[PDB]
């Protein structure tokens, strides 16, 4: 037979497998971007969606 | 590559460094049509000021 899901029944199980990251996900290498503005405001194409 | 740059607007500076780098290392010929310039013809005696 297959193993019954723990949540499926009313017993309490005090040992469980818990998935976890090996080390902190916040490595401090936050994403940064080169925004580069339009050269001329009048030239901008608002049109077409 | 005979790259043609009709407009430098929006170009990454990193990409521009890359393109000149390919001009030098990969022997790219890049043609920038956006640019306008006056010219001066120096005599060999006066050199490049």
Which of chain B's residues have a Cβ under 8 Å away from the Cβ of A39?
9-10
Are B11 and A36 in contact by the 8 Å Cβ rule? The answer is yes
B36–A contact, CB cutoff 8 A: no
Method: cryo-EM
A12-21: b (≥16 Cβ within 10 Å) or e: eeeeeeeeee
**Would you give the DSSP letter of residue A7?**
T
Mark yes or no for CB contact A39/B11 under 8 Å: no
What is d(CA B2, CA A5) in angstroms, rounded to the nearest whole number? Answer: 64
Q: With CB atoms and an 8 Å threshold, state whether B10 touches A38.
A: yes
Bridge partner list, B32: B5
């Amino acid at each position: 037979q297959v193993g019954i899901p723990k949540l499926e029944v009313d017993h309490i199980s005090f040992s469980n497998v818990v998935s976890m990251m090996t080390a902190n996900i916040r490595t401090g290498d936050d994403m940064a971007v080169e925004r580069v503005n339009p050269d001329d405001v009048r030239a901008i194409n608002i049109r077409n969606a | 590559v005979h790259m043609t740059i009709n407009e430098r607007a929006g170009m990454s500076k990193l990409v521009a460094d890359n393109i000149i780098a390919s001009v030098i290392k990969s022997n790219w010929v890049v043609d920038i049509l956006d640019i306008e310039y006056t010219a001066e013809v120096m005599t060999p005696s006066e050199g490049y000021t």
